[PDB]
Amino acid sequence: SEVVSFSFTKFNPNPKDIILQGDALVTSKGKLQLTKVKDGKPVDHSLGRALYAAPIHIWDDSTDRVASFATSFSFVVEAPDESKTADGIAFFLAPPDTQPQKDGGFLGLFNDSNKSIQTVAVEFDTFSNTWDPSARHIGINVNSIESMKYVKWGWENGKVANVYISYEASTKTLTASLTYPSNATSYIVSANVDLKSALPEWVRVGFSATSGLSRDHVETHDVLDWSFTSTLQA
Amino acid sequence: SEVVSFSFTKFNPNPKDIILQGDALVTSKGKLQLTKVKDGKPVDHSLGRALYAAPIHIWDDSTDRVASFATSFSFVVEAPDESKTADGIAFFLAPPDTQPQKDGGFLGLFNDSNKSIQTVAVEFDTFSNTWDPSARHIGINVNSIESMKYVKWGWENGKVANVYISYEASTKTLTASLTYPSNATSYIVSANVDLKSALPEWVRVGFSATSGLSRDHVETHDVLDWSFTSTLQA
Amino acid sequence: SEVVSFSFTKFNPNPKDIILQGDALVTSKGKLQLTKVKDGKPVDHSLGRALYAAPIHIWDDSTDRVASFATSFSFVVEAPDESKTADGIAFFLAPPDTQPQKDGGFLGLFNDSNKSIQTVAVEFDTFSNTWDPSARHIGINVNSIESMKYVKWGWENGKVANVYISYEASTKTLTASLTYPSNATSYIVSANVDLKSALPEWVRVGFSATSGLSRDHVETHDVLDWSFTSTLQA
Amino acid sequence: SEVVSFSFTKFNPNPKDIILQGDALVTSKGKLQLTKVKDGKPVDHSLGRALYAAPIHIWDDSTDRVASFATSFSFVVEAPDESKTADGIAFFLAPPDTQPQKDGGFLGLFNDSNKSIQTVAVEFDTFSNTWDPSARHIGINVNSIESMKYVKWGWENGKVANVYISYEASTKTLTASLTYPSNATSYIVSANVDLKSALPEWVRVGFSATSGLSRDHVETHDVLDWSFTSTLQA
Ligand SMILES: [Ca+2]
Ligand SMILES: [Ca+2]
Ligand SMILES: [Ca+2]
Ligand SMILES: [Ca+2]
Ligand SMILES: [Mn+2]
Ligand SMILES: [Mn+2]
Ligand SMILES: [Mn+2]
Ligand SMILES: [Mn+2]
Secondary structure, three states: OOOOEEEEEOOOOOOOOOEEEOOOOOOOOOOOOOOOOEEEEEEOOEEEEEEEEEEEEOOOOOOOOEEEEEEEEEEEEOOOOOOOEEEEEEEEOOOOOOOOOOOOOOOOOOOOOOOOOEEEEEEEEOOOOOOOOOOEEEEEEOOOOOOEEEEOOOOOOOEEEEEEEEOOOOOOOEEEEHHHHHOEEEEEEEEEOOHHHHOOEEEEEEEEEEEEEOOOOOOOOEEEEEEEEEEEEO | EEEEEEEEOOOOOOOOOOEEEOOOOEEEOOOEEEEEEEEOOOOOOOEEEEEEOOOOOEEOOOOOOEEEEEEEEEEEEEOOOOOOOOOEEEEEEEOOOOOOOOHHHHHOOOOOOOOOOEEEEEEEEEOOOOOOOOOOOEEEEEEEOOOOOEEOOOOOOOOOOEEEEEEOOOEEEEEEEEEEEEOEEEEEEEEEHHHHOOOOOEEEEEEEEEOOOOOHHHHHHHHEEEEEEEEOOO | OOEEEEEOOOOOOOOOEEEEEEOOOOOOOOOOOOOOOEEEEEEEOOEEEEOOOOOOOEEOOOOEOOEEEEEEEEOOOOOOOOOOEEEEEEEEOOOOOOOOOOHHHHHHOOOOOOOOOOOEEEEEEEOOOOOOOOOOEEEEEEOOOOOOEEEEEOOOOOOEEEEEEEOOOOOOOEEEEEOOOOOOEEEEEEEEOOHHHHHHEEEEEEEEEOOOOOOOOOOOOEEEEEEEEEEEEO | OEEEEEEEEEEEEEOOOOOEOOOEOOOOOOOOOOEEEEEOOOOOOOOOEEOOOOEEEEEEEOOOOOOOEEEEEEEEEEOOOOOOOEEEEEEEEOOOOOOOOOOOOHHHOOOOOOOOOOEEEEEEEOOOOOOOOOOOOOEEEEOOOOOOOOEEEOOOOOOOOEEEEEEEOOOOOEEEEEEEEOEEEEEEEEEOOOHHHHOOOOOEEEEEEOOOOOOOOOOOEEEEEEEEOOOOOO
């Protein structure tokens, strides 16, 4: 494929363009609620993922070409307690048949299987596990729950976060930024990532999130909108 | 969904974005060959269809809104004999789980089942069946192999045909045009079509084609490229 | 330039993106009224033109490349008398400094100067002059008020006409279609046009219209919206 | 206007889409060289600006609506000496008739006139003047050479910088990021900026740059490509 694009200003309650996995659902107001909410309150031990229906052609073995892509999405992570939060939300790419992996700190993306899984993620990590830096962080993750690069992230409870992720194929640069319009505060991180080596030719793209494994480490992970475009020169 | 787009300047030999049904395949040079070719020669009794992976949201029961869409594709129909041709090629919309229907003059789109099937097609018909006008034609077909409107079509054997189809939701106008750049000859037809009444909320879009049911009524039906865009106001 | 696009769903009353020439104005409801209207009634001897502010790079002498482009616009031509009409409306390309040429049957586009002017137009001609066929027509015009190709055009008084014009650089094919959603009636014409030979490298694009030179040959020429895109491979 | 877009993968040597002011020129290889280079070496006391030909409709007094916009551009600033650099490069919006203002630290954008000029800029400042913080910085500037917000910027001599600027009208958030693909290092800054209050309804957008006012404070300021899109809801 050469060019694929799609833009949701909000999500449809029974989405056919979006493959919902685990606890993910679209609320009737059109928020993509990745992790469970009960009586308006986030629940623990939740794992939800959402992928776009069409696979994306990110590289081609015949032509040796790599896709470029850009995506925008806004998301909210709201926790009943500012200091106890887990586990986070991520935008990711994985093989098209990708299924939910471990919950909790593995973010539904990775596992501890000793079989290195193919998934490239931009995580917004709200809990410091063994493999994390100390502070909440935006991480670029290449086939590991351990980020290859991260920036410390001043998570704002319940505030809309605007994210813009792009991948420039000609330089192998993956760049992720987050901005909180509420107080015009922003964070960015970039990495040199070889998508040909990390991922298969075709992938599915989307989001994954998990709530903490305890009652006092719960938060929501809602996506409010999403735009994506990818071009493969071919 | 609000906006979905995709553009192929040619097709990938093992397409993941394109669901190939019946005899459809992508050749190694990237043509979408809907009907069978053997030793470079079209074969009879063939039926092939290709659909885009992502369903398209063409209308919404809650918001009462209808999508607009536009698509461009180029296609070749080549017959070893100018005067004996069958059966044709079509661009269509159908429920997402749509499967190949009858072969031959039914174009893989419709059947004679007495169970009116949901499919809206723009056919390029190369054989005059019982339900057709006399001459080869471009037809707009709403849940029937019988066109509600058609224009006579001067098919050019083996020449590239450029098609542009659009649907204007605000007026319910479906317009289909074909141009042969080789001699700058063009045909157009339009119809007032209520997609809400003809189709379910979500559909898949693509192409369907069949070769004749006899050895002396064979032709190819190759699509060379394809661009599509649909917006649902919501 | 490689890609230029712009889309108006209606026009701004004091447009800065649109260079208005002669009698052209934008009404407060956002219609581009090319020719004069007085007390709601079309006036004779009027000439109005509108061009997009940015020049469009349609070909390049260094790279030998030609642009492709596509444009959509809706327009109304309303005459107080169905049988007496003049003169018409056109979409055109001309050098960027292009100024209004002759009025009346020259459509503000051409003149009788014996100095062949550079302008390539798709005219919707409502009056049969000396150089016209008999019937109202959609014409493709290459540096002459005389069309190189035309299709007879069933003008519908006061009805919205939807036009789609495209130019495919790889085949030099200019295609123009018009559809009246009101009764789903359509017309199309195509021509092999060498834009490199007809036009300079850079042009401005837009509309031109004139009302008849007599009181009993008056009509309006309003454009309701306009989308344009052009890509030059370079 | 509702939607305006344009994308250059490089610039044309005699650009008609781009209004070049002061010393700005396009090199024969298609770089937009804002400030003077002599025998391949940057010259002092230079000031160059480039604007897109079409004005952009950023807000509308009648409808009370504000545009959103996004733009990407890559740029190089190369100095013969790493530690002596001046003055910088900026992306800006200003009234359409905007002309070059003061040189040097005023970046061709502002002056010391005591007549507050309308210009909103995202500067990449390479020299600490009286109104600057100490370190080189990316600044958001609203009708002043003094930034309202800035982030410290690790300028990389002679390296390609990729910038992405967006403005979200619904939150009044202007966000600017820079990434050096060479070592995947990134910077971002955001501000709450009211474009209705800072700028007139229509503007022109582009770049401005100046070299230092001394021989030992020289650098280049070349833009390599540029994409822009703006939508005004209206
Ligand atoms: Ca963690
Ligand atoms: Ca038939
Ligand atoms: Ca005439
Ligand atoms: Ca400075
Ligand atoms: Mn982490
Ligand atoms: Mn038929
Ligand atoms: Mn004529
Ligand atoms: Mn500064």
